[PDB]
Amino acid sequence: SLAPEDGSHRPAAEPTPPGAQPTAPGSLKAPDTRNEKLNSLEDVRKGSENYALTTNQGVRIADDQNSLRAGSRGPTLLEDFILREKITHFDHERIPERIVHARGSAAHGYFQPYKSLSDITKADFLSDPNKITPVFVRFSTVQGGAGSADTVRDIRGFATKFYTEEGIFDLVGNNTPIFFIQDAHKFPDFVHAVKPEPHWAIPQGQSAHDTFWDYVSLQPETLHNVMWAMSDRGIPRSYRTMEGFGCHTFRLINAEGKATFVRFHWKPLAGKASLVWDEAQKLTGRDPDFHRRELWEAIEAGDFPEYELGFQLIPEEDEFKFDFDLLDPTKLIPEELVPVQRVGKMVLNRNPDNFFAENEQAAFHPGHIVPGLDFTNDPLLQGRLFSYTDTQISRLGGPNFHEIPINRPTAPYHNFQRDGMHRMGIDTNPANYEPNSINDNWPRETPPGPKRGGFESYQERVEGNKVRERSPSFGEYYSHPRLFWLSQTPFEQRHIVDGFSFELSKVVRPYIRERVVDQLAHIDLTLAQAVAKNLGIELTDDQLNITPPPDVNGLKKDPSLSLYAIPDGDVKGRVVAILLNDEVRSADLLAILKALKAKGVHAKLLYSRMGEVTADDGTVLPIAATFAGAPSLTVDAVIVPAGNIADIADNGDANYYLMEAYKHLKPIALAGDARKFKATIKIADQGEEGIVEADSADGSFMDELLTLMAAHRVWSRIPKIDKIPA
Amino acid sequence: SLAPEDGSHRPAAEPTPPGAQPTAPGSLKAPDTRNEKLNSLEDVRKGSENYALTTNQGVRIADDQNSLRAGSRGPTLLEDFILREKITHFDHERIPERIVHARGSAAHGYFQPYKSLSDITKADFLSDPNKITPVFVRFSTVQGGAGSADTVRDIRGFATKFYTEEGIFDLVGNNTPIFFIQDAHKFPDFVHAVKPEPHWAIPQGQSAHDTFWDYVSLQPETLHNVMWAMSDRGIPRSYRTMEGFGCHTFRLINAEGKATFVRFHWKPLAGKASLVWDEAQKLTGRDPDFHRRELWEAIEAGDFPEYELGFQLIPEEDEFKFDFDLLDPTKLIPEELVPVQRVGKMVLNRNPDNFFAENEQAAFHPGHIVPGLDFTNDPLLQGRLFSYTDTQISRLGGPNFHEIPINRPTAPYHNFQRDGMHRMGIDTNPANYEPNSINDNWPRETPPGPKRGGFESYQERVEGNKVRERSPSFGEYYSHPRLFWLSQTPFEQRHIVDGFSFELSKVVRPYIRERVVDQLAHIDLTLAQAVAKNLGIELTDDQLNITPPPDVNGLKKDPSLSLYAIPDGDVKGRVVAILLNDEVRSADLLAILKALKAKGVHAKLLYSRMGEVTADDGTVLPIAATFAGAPSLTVDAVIVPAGNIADIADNGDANYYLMEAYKHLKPIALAGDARKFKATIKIADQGEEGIVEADSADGSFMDELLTLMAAHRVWSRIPKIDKIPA
Ligand code: HDE
Ligand code: HDD
Ligand SMILES: [S]
Ligand SMILES: [S]
């Protein structure tokens, strides 16, 4: 017995806030959280307590600390099969990572529609508000490896596996509504351009390098999704606080056979929120697992990630009524033109047990649709349909990847396919072909119908010659970039300018920088000039006179394109650093902690060492982490209570904590003599917006602080930080 | 879509300083640099200029921008074989990464011995000072994935493939002289404990988590290599500035059959140098590719990484003469007891062409020895011999991995092995077995002998029973940790204390921290007290009374264990940041660059935007990067020349740049009015050791700066950095 006698090795099986307990496998942390999929995995879950240590063949091991050798200092013997089985399994642990979205964090949960959508789709999962569909969702970056950092600037993946009663449906989306390229044939060119360059395999998790911006400069179709990636969209605060999109027009098909064009949306019920660049980049160093960690701990805390599924619906007759092509995945559909209809709610409420088995091996693919859904001729979507089945053959070792437990349907599956590597199912059918008489032709085809029918494609009219040709309707590249630009707040525009500037600064060949600046001048002159000024480049008279592209169907902005123009803040699940001193005013801390708790805001108590400190009244205060151990990057706001401030007034890390939080536009609250830190961050005596200060933490001090957190960051501070040495 | 007329897309094929040109594949950068191995790869190097784009089948492609579809807005057709090949190759690009050392950076070079070693070994590559052996070296971290960051705290790998005339020899070593564990059977337990924890796959690139410290607290044999990891050895400045070691006792065998025990060493000719932790950690976010990049740019610049191979030699009769067991890989052999004998020099002078094909697919394995070398019964080495061949079967796809070009011997290979996946060699031999008469028994066995003989194992006597039992002589765990601790300088010791304190503070279960502090009390009470204090732990009376372990054969310390105790600085290849203003004093910059050039020290010119600035005399100065884009983390020292200092005096980034450099102990030099920045880092008028200052940058000023750089960091400044908020 190596566990501590007090049982402190084992986390409580109850919701607990981030940092309060060690983290654990989902089925141990929350054994009573269940759904049909999670229950169906029971046949393969393997425990441990009270069991003997064995080989994989079931043979009990006596000494798992030594190899068999001739003499205790002699050579290891080949007959040591215990050693070789153990080292063999280790030697073969790794499987190929995903070609893109290799870095990803996943969780189990459930989806339910608000009402039956039978008038527009026969999809069973959307037929009944009392129908609950288990889901497994993986969120991801795009460029970096499985061991790359979370808070890079990149697009994010948002993939949802719906285990429906009529088959698996995978909605394989991203956190922006468009993609960089129009035709799947170019996907290896684009991906190779953004990925580490092939001579030296640099840079990881970054588009800030020559080949990416070379490609963009030569391929103006890319500029729309580039605008999104250069915006704070590219650096989300949390997977809980980004939007999701299904990227293409698909179709819904109802029982009567009518097709409706649809684009899919996920609205984050925790609101939209992003980091700022210096913070996100520094955070890849201080905690490269910050989003994986945050997702896991939100679920352990009961702050379940929730998202509302929404559809933009376009009648077949209106296919051609927009300035842009509905099939062009570089174009978005503005919500001012086509609103998002709410459809239902997804809640992610349990972590996996084993990350490799459930996360790394999960396979999502947008061809996995069900009756009630269908594709369109979007030529990026079209090529995706080939890729996501093909790539599993090496990634997951063969064509039986649907038998890997996470991937299995909960719906019945029966057919005449046989064999392949790793075959698990033992087929008893006398027949392995159809038509057959020897098993009365079972399993049998099923006519399409209103429910439980076989899949039949919508009979879309095709007409044209066999051509490798881009549609002329796809040949417009600047108006959507411009619509996005004009829809952002002035601070968001500034962050976009700074994103392009920083990235182009890492492009070693200056002519590539110049060429990208020329493209910017085709989108918006102000944008182009500000990026130019940062790069020491002067626009030509010609560039200064490029006429801007047309409005999009008469729109000069659409505020739904902004993260922040329409407030949607939610403080629950956010976190506040509390900077302790060795004699804290206990009445301040009582008022602070209870106000945070009442709003579901977490706290972490920090100090200059671990262990404990004692408050003015003798309360013992446990310390979560040191100032350097848990940097302001990791929190949403900072509170300093009154007390013996002289203890930390000259601590460089304490001061730097405030300067860093200040620079990144985070709310900061100072009570009593903690106001002496005003000098550190240069705050006027009479105060400033975004700094909460009072004689004590009572009265309106916590409300004012929470009000600031609800608006996420203090954008008004931007001109003040410019000159801060931090 | 083409190259600029001015040819600026293409790097000069001549040595150039870091940042002066885009980096490039080795064979294009340095086409005249050759060795026998580099030439033998010419069969598979593929160019590109003037060639038509084709499928893999050699069919020319007319339109690589589009999928074949029925109409230009129609569905993609299954007959588009050009799309499917392209997409299929892309879908299957990734192979499994290495179970450990997945993150690594490699280059080509050559080795030659200083003198014939035929008195001690018949190994052909050590037989003649004029026989040059091509090498391919890969440097690595251990825990993180192939997309994890370089400047983590971790052991580093240092693996060298020697392409000798008598076969491949791989010396597969690390940058510390021991390992954490004694028996290979435990390798998967230790590696699982240090790797990201299985439920949530956190943390990447870090031992700072509960399972690693749990295993260490329970397995005191690990404490020696833990001490090394917690010291600054865990965070090297560069692969060029760390030591390498072979980890085990091997044997040299001479022509007469005499066995000598040997331990291998690599001495960095650029000297020993490491980062400090705050710098290392922050640099994983600012440039997760820093070591990869620095290695590549050093080779492009002509600062070729050079290492001296060295042997510790122990005669056979001396096997039992120390107070530790020679075969125990948790024990080092102190150089005070057994000196390193210099054996020869290795020079890395060319980068690869394609990182995947040459670096990622390279296979190194310490069982790849040649006649003149042999093994010992080290029980860690014994089990490694199984693993490095086994793991290739999944990683490199089968038993023909030696036919992957980078892995091929330059020596002849012929044998009776046939088939396997992706078999390249087409054997014409009528026989595939021996003995055979049908091919007169060729290829034939070769008796052993002085040179060009067949491999025969040294006939070591084996006497003992078949046991799984650790040798009693291995059961001592504290004396080597202690010898290491006592050999460090006071600042090195502080950094070790801080490493343990930082790491344990991230262990969530407090009993684990306590158990580790109890282990530390068995090594040294001062160390144990200093860590305890940071964790808020008080040692018990019993802990205070633990008898320190014995000296190691009479040694109180061995200065060769310290990175810094004996000066060995080499500034060539180091880099300085020069912070520009909009009217640089050209006379200062002239003297600065001239002095740096004389010692082979590089410069990067930084400013608040990109583009150019013009000096006082009209000289146009291109800007390498902004203050934010290339932070003081990435350089060895900072110089601020005179001129229009008002331009940058109030720039927050310029000020921070000096605060960060100062905090990280780097030399700083300030000329003329740049002395105004003294106020940001609180230097008194009198000056301070480590800050160079004068009216202008002259002979004296640059000599002083260069002397400081030869000492790497300004350790005396440590007392003054607590206070700086940076
Ligand atoms: C709409 C959201 C989106 C878009 C437009 C694309 N990806 Fe994705 N992708 C693969 C291929 C592929 C192609 C051929 C295209 C356009 C032609 C896209 N992508 C764009 C893949 C290589 O087959 C992929 C890698 C492993 C795998 O199973 O499939 C793949 C991954 C991927 C994910 C991750 C799913 C997961 O396992 O977590 C996501 C969210 C996307 N793509 C979205 C996506
Ligand atoms: C019995 C298991 C085992 C043990 C005990 C060790 N190794 Fe190992 N090592 C492996 C099993 C392994 C491996 C699993 O076989 C790897 C990764 C896959 C590879 O080809 O080999 C590897 C890779 C690997 C590499 C990377 C080579 C490259 O660049 O490709 C290095 C430098 C080392 N090891 C160094 C060491 C040192 C200094 C050890 C202490 C003596 C050591 N290994 C013990
Ligand atoms: S998309
Ligand atoms: S080792």
Side-chain angles (χ1 to χ4, degrees), chain A residues 168-276:
Chain A
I168 294 291
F169 165 48
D170 294 327
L171 174 56
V172 187
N174 281 348
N175 70 331
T176 76
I178 71 288
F179 198 58
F180 294 100
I181 66 167
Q182 293 179 330
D183 190 306
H185 193 70
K186 292 215 69 76
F187 192 69
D189 292 310
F190 175 73
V191 174
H192 283 190
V194 77
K195 275 282 178 169
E197 302 190 5
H199 53 306
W200 63 349
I202 293 186
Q204 204 63 217
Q206 305 156 62
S207 54
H209 58 106
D210 293 47
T211 58
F212 171 77
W213 288 102
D214 196 35
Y215 191 92
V216 171
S217 78
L218 296 174
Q219 294 285 269
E221 67 196 55
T222 67
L223 289 155
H224 192 197
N225 211 203
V226 170
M227 292 292 298
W228 284 74
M230 290 310 108
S231 82
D232 292 348
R233 295 272 187 164
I235 47 173
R237 161 59 182 83
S238 160
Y239 297 139
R240 305 181 299 111
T241 67
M242 68 188 194
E243 284 176 317
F245 302 94
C247 337
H248 312 282
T249 313
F250 288 76
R251 293 174 158 117
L252 303 185
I253 303 300
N254 67 13
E256 282 65 42
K258 173 159 82 141
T260 308
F261 293 114
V262 57
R263 291 209 186 175
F264 299 120
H265 286 247
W266 287 117
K267 174 180 172 175
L269 302 174
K272 294 168 282 167
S274 281
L275 308 180
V276 304

